[PDB]
Amino acid sequence: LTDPIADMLTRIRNATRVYKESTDVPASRFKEEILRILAREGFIKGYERVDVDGKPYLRVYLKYGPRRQGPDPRPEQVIHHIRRISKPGRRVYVGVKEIPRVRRGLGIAILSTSKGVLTDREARKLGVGGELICEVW
Amino acid sequence: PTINQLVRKGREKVRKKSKVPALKGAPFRRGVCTVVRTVTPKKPNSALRKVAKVRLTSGYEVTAYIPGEGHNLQEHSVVLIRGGRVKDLPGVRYHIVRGVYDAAGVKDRKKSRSKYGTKKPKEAA
RNA sequence: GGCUAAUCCCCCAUGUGGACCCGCCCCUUGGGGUGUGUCCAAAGGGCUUUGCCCGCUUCCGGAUGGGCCCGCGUCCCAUCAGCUAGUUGGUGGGGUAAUGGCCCACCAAGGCGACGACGGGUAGCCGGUCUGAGAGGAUGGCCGGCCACAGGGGCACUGAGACACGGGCCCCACUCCUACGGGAGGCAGCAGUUAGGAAUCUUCCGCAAUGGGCGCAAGCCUGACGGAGCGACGCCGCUUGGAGGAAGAAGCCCUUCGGGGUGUAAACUCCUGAACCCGGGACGAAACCCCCGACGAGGGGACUGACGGUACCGGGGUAAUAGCGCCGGCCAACUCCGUGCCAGCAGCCGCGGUAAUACGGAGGGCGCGAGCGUUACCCGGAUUCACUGGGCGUAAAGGGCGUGUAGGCGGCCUGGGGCGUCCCAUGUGAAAGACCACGGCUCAACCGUGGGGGAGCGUGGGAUACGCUCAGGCUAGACGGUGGGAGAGGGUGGUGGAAUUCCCGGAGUAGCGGUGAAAUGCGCAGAUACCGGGAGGAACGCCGAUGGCGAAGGCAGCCACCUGGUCCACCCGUGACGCUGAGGCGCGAAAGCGUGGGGAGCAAACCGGAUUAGAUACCCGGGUAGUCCACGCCCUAAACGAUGCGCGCUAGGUCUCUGGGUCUCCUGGGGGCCGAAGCUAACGCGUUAAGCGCGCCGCCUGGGGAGUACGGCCGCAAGGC
RNA sequence: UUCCCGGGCCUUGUACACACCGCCCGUCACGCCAUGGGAGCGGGCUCUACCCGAAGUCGCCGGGAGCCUACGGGCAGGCGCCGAGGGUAGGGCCCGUGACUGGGGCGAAGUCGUAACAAGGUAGCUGUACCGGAAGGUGCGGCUGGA
Ligand SMILES: [Mg+2]
Ligand SMILES: [Mg+2]
Ligand SMILES: [Mg+2]
Ligand SMILES: [Mg+2]
Ligand SMILES: [Mg+2]
Ligand SMILES: [Mg+2]
Ligand SMILES: [Mg+2]
Ligand SMILES: [Mg+2]
Ligand SMILES: [Mg+2]
Ligand SMILES: [Mg+2]
Ligand SMILES: [Mg+2]
Ligand SMILES: [Mg+2]
Ligand SMILES: [Mg+2]
Ligand SMILES: [Mg+2]
Ligand SMILES: [Mg+2]
Ligand SMILES: [Mg+2]
Ligand SMILES: [Mg+2]
Ligand SMILES: [Mg+2]
Ligand SMILES: [Mg+2]
Ligand SMILES: [Mg+2]
Ligand SMILES: [Mg+2]
Ligand SMILES: [Mg+2]
Ligand SMILES: [Mg+2]
Ligand SMILES: [Mg+2]
Ligand SMILES: [Mg+2]
Ligand SMILES: [Mg+2]
Ligand SMILES: [Mg+2]
Ligand SMILES: [Mg+2]
Ligand SMILES: [Mg+2]
Ligand SMILES: [Mg+2]
Ligand SMILES: [Mg+2]
Ligand SMILES: [Mg+2]
Ligand SMILES: [Mg+2]
Ligand SMILES: [Mg+2]
Ligand SMILES: [Mg+2]
Ligand SMILES: [Mg+2]
Ligand SMILES: [Mg+2]
Ligand SMILES: [Mg+2]
Ligand SMILES: [Mg+2]
Ligand SMILES: [Mg+2]
Ligand SMILES: [Mg+2]
Ligand SMILES: [Mg+2]
Ligand SMILES: [Mg+2]
Ligand SMILES: [Mg+2]
Ligand SMILES: [Mg+2]
Ligand SMILES: [Mg+2]
Ligand SMILES: [Mg+2]
Ligand SMILES: [Mg+2]
Ligand SMILES: [Mg+2]
Ligand SMILES: [Mg+2]
Ligand SMILES: [Mg+2]
Ligand SMILES: [Mg+2]
Ligand SMILES: [Mg+2]
Ligand SMILES: [Mg+2]
Ligand SMILES: [Mg+2]
Known part of the structure; x- marks a missing residue:
């Protein structure tokens, strides 16, 4: 890694493009404040502190739009x-x-x-x- | 590039070339002609365009075009060089002003006669 | 040579005070005070006089202006890579108002440079101006501020200040006067002349106002300045009329000749009224002056205009200049006639070789209008230098590959500093220009007043999320340890056989090689084909491939030694040791070069024989360097996956190579195919990305000229960068 | 149904699209334009070393030779260093020009050949070396931008 924040936001972006429920970013205090702002404004469903293999990650729970109708039924992004x-x-x-x-x-x-x-x-x-x-x- | 490559090298400005080397930006150059003749254009056309090779006051000796129909230019005519090239004539990058020095205007021209340098006539009007 | 006066010079006196050395105190780099010793002042003039005014000298303080130094910013060329003799630092002096290597002696050997020295080219710089949505790009004309010059160059004196446009000295060049021997001059001041050039004006009026100098004042000087004159050079304002007016005069153009257009356009009727005539006629001007008042404050009075009888006001009063570009698409405006690749048009595409809305004219229409076009330059469009805001698989472009210096960037937790960063206050950021509002010229242009902030930098205070630093700790990054694994990875030495060629021996015949067919060629001098033996060199069949290894080039019989890289398991240790990488360094197919060795087969050049019109080729027979080895060079390529490296994320299905396991199966690294989302102009890529993101390096800015020329570096050369 | 002529469908390749009676490459011949090398010629800028060196500041002398208003001093004058500039000699950089010569580009429709584009009739391309009027041919090695 060089910029961990750009890694976090790119992982959130790739999660939003494939409509995944939640992902795992590495844990940091500054990252936690960014996810606090993204949860306060309503871009995600919130975060939690989890431990994957004894190593602290963060479950960013994703938020999407309503399931559209007509062709390409993928819902509109929140992000x-x-x-x-x-x-x-x-x-x-x-x-x-x-x-x-x-x-x-x-x-x-x-x-x-x-x-x-x-x-x-x-x-x-x-x-x-x-x-x-x-x-x- | 990256941001550091733009610090180490920066951007390169355009640095264009003037198509008219008329000595440091003069719109008009006085000149005495040397050779007045007719040339042939490029393949897409066929005519006998009237030109003159002018030795002018900047030390240069260029060829220029003679616009209009008919002229009074000879071996020792003092002309004025305008600028702008002729596309079908290679080497010709200049025009001769008519109505100045020794290059009189087009006789009996009435529609576009400021260019080609002809006075207003008066046919009792 | 001789007098002579001063606010001219010199000497003596006093010393508020000042200067100098020494000592002391405070401060603290030459600031202030103090004690001894020394040195240093002066000038008078005018009235209404023993009272003022203008002056003089010393010192301290203020104001203004200036000198010097420092932090930061300020064009192009790296085809300019090394520069430096007073050069860099110290000590003692000279000089200056003053630091300083500014200058001079002595000592030391330093100083600068890829963060671009030195050199070459160009340029006065700024507030500003033009353009641009902005960011930017360009520019420094008028005005204001700073600098530097006064024909080129050098130098000092006077002086508070000059190295001095209209002051001095000298040298060179130019002009003029000379009785020839020696004298005058410096328009880049205001006009003006000459030359150059596309181009730039009046040898005008006045000190009436502002300002400058001198003088107590009166007053004097001011080509600064206020004005006028010339040039559409730019901007702004106004005029060449307005209202009526024929189902629409004439001329002219078009016509499917019935008609349509110019066209309310015109003629014609009423009306206003530019220019002209008469009369009046200023604002800018109020002080300095005088009187009262103590020539203080305050009050009153008088003189003074260039512009200029100009602006302007009142009355009278005349229908009174219009031109320029365009009319094929961009781009607004269409027909006819003449011409016929001719004349010609042209900013691009491109028109014209007989019916041209593109050439020339006419009618008409369009766009502007005392302007309209053209040329030259700057910005824009140009997101074609991309910070905003571009790209590199095939269009331009990934360095041939690796190691690695500087540099750039960098994991998680908690503290200290608060440098970057942010906030507030304050000072500066001159004026003018720009913005907004209100006014003065009857509007506007122009100008005045007031308000408002920009950006940057100094100072003080506050905050720590992020970047930075210091310190403590952590392990996911990286490396190591233990135990194994696969592999044509590399170097050295040795060795096995197949096969080709040659030599010897036996046997054996009239042909063998070769082609599309032939021929050259080889062969009764005993060939090809057969066997046996011997010599020599090169490459390793089957295994063996869509395989493996390596960073690339590349690497394939086998054995031994030396040796690098890499993968898995155990999760044992260090603990952020990491990634990239301008230079440098190393490796670098094949061909080629030098020295020596070797040379069986192949095979550039060369020689034949065929084909062909011709063959310097393709086909065939010979055949020299080279291909092989040791050492040293050469540094190129379709060196290609035309895809740089490192890391994180994003469905899978399938084939295969190599480890581990709790072996239907799961997990790690690697080699292929099809394909989610996504990307691409398409072909295609797709966890072996050309997708989503970050860090760093290299590269591209239309084609040709051209990887050429010149210069520099390397090479024995070819040649390479 | 191999061959020669014409034709229909599918597929592959193309640098053809006035469409193979297509396109295109190079030498040679003529004219013009710009340019490199070139025995040299001319000019500008700049550097180093020395010789001569005015005015002038500064430093000594100011004496067998002057003048002075205060003299163990001053002025004039003399000597020395620096000194603009002139000269001599040798370098560096740049510009114009030069008999001749190399290649580039554009022209009128010229001469010779068939290189490449379709397996272009020898697949093409590229590095290197040699050879040939010329495109090019061949040798070694590499690529698929062909099977
Ligand atoms: Mg006293
Ligand atoms: Mg005294
Ligand atoms: Mg200059
Ligand atoms: Mg723009
Ligand atoms: Mg002059
Ligand atoms: Mg003067
Ligand atoms: Mg003068
Ligand atoms: Mg003239
Ligand atoms: Mg005056
Ligand atoms: Mg005055
Ligand atoms: Mg009317
Ligand atoms: Mg009518
Ligand atoms: Mg009519
Ligand atoms: Mg007045
Ligand atoms: Mg139109
Ligand atoms: Mg036109
Ligand atoms: Mg026409
Ligand atoms: Mg106007
Ligand atoms: Mg731009
Ligand atoms: Mg432009
Ligand atoms: Mg960018
Ligand atoms: Mg681009
Ligand atoms: Mg390319
Ligand atoms: Mg590569
Ligand atoms: Mg590395
Ligand atoms: Mg960090
Ligand atoms: Mg700070
Ligand atoms: Mg201001
Ligand atoms: Mg630490
Ligand atoms: Mg452990
Ligand atoms: Mg090599
Ligand atoms: Mg070799
Ligand atoms: Mg050799
Ligand atoms: Mg020998
Ligand atoms: Mg052979
Ligand atoms: Mg033939
Ligand atoms: Mg024949
Ligand atoms: Mg042969
Ligand atoms: Mg390849
Ligand atoms: Mg795999
Ligand atoms: Mg695929
Ligand atoms: Mg080009
Ligand atoms: Mg080359
Ligand atoms: Mg059929
Ligand atoms: Mg053909
Ligand atoms: Mg030539
Ligand atoms: Mg030459
Ligand atoms: Mg020469
Ligand atoms: Mg000579
Ligand atoms: Mg022919
Ligand atoms: Mg062919
Ligand atoms: Mg062929
Ligand atoms: Mg061929
Ligand atoms: Mg050959
Ligand atoms: Mg080959």
Whole structure:
């Protein structure tokens, strides 16, 4: 691994593209805060701490849409798109005046502040900003 | 590339070439002609296009096209070089302005006569 | 040569104070104070006078301006890779207002450079301006700030300040005056002349306002400045009329000749009224001046305009310039006539060789309008340099392969710092430009006033999620340990047989080889075919393949030695030791090169004989280097899976190679096929990804010229990069 | 139903699509354009070493030779270093030009041959070496962009 957060979000993406019930990402505190935000906004059904072969993983329980009708009956995604911004090769840091609109407020930019790991609206209300981790919509 | 390769090397700008070497950006170059003759174009066409090889004030000696129907250009005519190439004529990258120095305008031309350099007539009108 | 005056010079005196050495104290790199010793000041002038005003000298403080130094940013060429003699540092001096290697002596040998030194080319820089959705790209004209120059170059003096446009000295070049021997000059100041060039103006008015210098003031100087003149050079505003007006005059164009278009367009009727005529006529201007008041504050009075009789106001009053580009698709506008690959048009596609909406004209229509087109340059479209925002299997592109330096990136838990990062406050970010609002020119252009923040950087305070560092700990990453496994992995030495060729011996005949058919050729000098023996060299049949090994090239009889890589099981130890990798280094098919050896078969070049019109080829017979070995070079390729490496995720079915097991079966590594989701322009890929993501390196920016030329490096050369 | 001529269906290959009476390659001949090498010629920029070296700051002398307003001092003058620039000699870089020569590109429809595209009539391509008017042929090894 080089960036464990991009590995976690890519594993969540590949889980959403095949409509799996749950997957296992490695356990970290920062990953747990990201999954806390993804559970508070309603992109997943929540997480739990599990131990696979004595080694701590995380059961990310996936959320999907209603089973559609007509051809291609795969349901619409909850997580249509997820992409890391602040790469370990190219770090991104923004201020409070520099927090983007994300699909006209429909999406979210999870970003890391000095007051903890926050969202785009919580970094505007508190007025802090920081390292812009990823976008989810 | 990667981000580090863009730090170590960066991007390369375009650095184009001017198609008109008329000495440091002059829109017009005065010149005295040397040889006035007719040439033949490329295969897709067939005509006798009127040209003149002009020795001009930048030290260059280029060939230019003579537009219009008929001209008064000779071995020692002082012309003005405009710019722009002729596609069917290789080597010709220039035009001769009419209505200046020694290149008079097209006689009896009335529709498009600013280009080709002809005065307004007056047929009691 | 001789007088002579000063706010000119010099000497003596006092010393608030200042300077210098020494010592001490505070501060702490030359700041402040103190004691002894020493040194250093001056100038008068004018009135309404023994009272002021302008001046003088020393010092301290303030304001403004400036010198010097430092952090960061600032074009292209790596076909510029090594640069450095005062060069780098110290000590003592000189010089400066002042640090400084600025300069000079002595000592040391350092200093800079892939984070791009040195060199070459180009360029004044910035606020800003143009474009662009933004990010960016381009640019530095007018205005403002800084720099540097005043024909080229060098130098000092006066001076608070200059290395000094209109000051000085010298050398070179140019012009002019010379009685020839020695003198004057420096428009890149405002006009203006000449040359160059596509191109850039008036040898105008005034100090009336602002500002600068001198002077107590009156006042004087100011080509700064305020204006006027010229150029559609740009922008803005206005005019060449408006309302009526024939089922629609004439001319002209088209016509299926009945008609349609120009076209309310025109002529014609009413009306307003540009330009012109008359009269008036300024804002910009109020101080400095004078009087009262103590020439203070305050009040009052008087003089002064270039622009200019100009803007403007009032009355009268005339129908009064329109042109330019286009009309095939982009792209808006269609017919006729002339021409007929001719004349010609053209930004691309491309038209014209007889019926052209593309050439030329006419009618008409379109787009602008005192402008319209063309040319030159910048941005855009160009997401064709992709940070935003591109790609590399086949279109351009994965380095031939590995090791590995710098660099880039990096697993889990808990603390300290708070550097990156974030927040707040404060200072700066000049003015002008841009944005918004309100106003002044009758609008606008132009201008004024007010407000609002950008970005960056200094300082203070606060936060620790992430990146960083320090410290403690953990094991999934990586490596090791133990016990095994498979393999054409590599090097050295030895060895077995089949087969080919040659030599010898026996026997044996009139043909053998060869082709599509022939021929050259070999053969009664006893061939081919048969047997026996001997010599020599090269490659290893069957096993043996859709197989295995290796990083690639590549590796295949067998045996022995030396040796690397790799896989499984046990989960034993270290404990983040990891991944990639610009250079460098090593390996690197075949052909080729050098030295020596060897040479049976094959076989470039060469020689024949056929085919063919011709054969420098294909076919056949000979045949030299080479193919083989040792050592040293050469570094190329369809070196290909045309797919770089490492890691994590994402249905499976099936064949096979190799371990382990609790052997219907499960698990690990590897080699193939079909295929979920997904990707691709398609072919196709598909856990051996070309899918989903991260880290790093290499590479691409239309084809040809061209992997060519020049330069550099390597090679004996061919040649390679 | 092997052969020659014409034809129908399927499949494979193509660089053909005015469609094999297709396309296309290279040498030679003529003209033009740009360019490399080239005995050399001319010019510009720059570096090093030395010789001469004005004005001028600075450092000594200021004396058998001057002038002074305060003299164990000053001015003039003299000597020395640096010194713009001029000269000499040798390098480096760049630009134009040069008899001749190599190859590139475009032209009018030229001459010779058949290389490649279909098994293009010897499968093609590539590295290397040799040879041949020329495309090319052959030898070794490699690839499927053919069976
Ligand atoms: Mg005292
Ligand atoms: Mg005294
Ligand atoms: Mg310059
Ligand atoms: Mg753009
Ligand atoms: Mg001059
Ligand atoms: Mg002066
Ligand atoms: Mg002057
Ligand atoms: Mg002229
Ligand atoms: Mg004045
Ligand atoms: Mg004044
Ligand atoms: Mg009217
Ligand atoms: Mg009518
Ligand atoms: Mg009519
Ligand atoms: Mg006034
Ligand atoms: Mg149209
Ligand atoms: Mg047209
Ligand atoms: Mg026409
Ligand atoms: Mg106008
Ligand atoms: Mg762009
Ligand atoms: Mg462009
Ligand atoms: Mg990108
Ligand atoms: Mg692309
Ligand atoms: Mg390719
Ligand atoms: Mg490769
Ligand atoms: Mg490595
Ligand atoms: Mg980390
Ligand atoms: Mg910090
Ligand atoms: Mg400002
Ligand atoms: Mg640690
Ligand atoms: Mg253990
Ligand atoms: Mg090799
Ligand atoms: Mg070899
Ligand atoms: Mg050899
Ligand atoms: Mg020998
Ligand atoms: Mg043979
Ligand atoms: Mg024949
Ligand atoms: Mg014959
Ligand atoms: Mg043979
Ligand atoms: Mg292969
Ligand atoms: Mg497998
Ligand atoms: Mg497949
Ligand atoms: Mg090209
Ligand atoms: Mg080559
Ligand atoms: Mg049938
Ligand atoms: Mg043919
Ligand atoms: Mg030539
Ligand atoms: Mg040459
Ligand atoms: Mg030469
Ligand atoms: Mg000569
Ligand atoms: Mg022929
Ligand atoms: Mg052929
Ligand atoms: Mg063939
Ligand atoms: Mg062939
Ligand atoms: Mg041959
Ligand atoms: Mg072969």
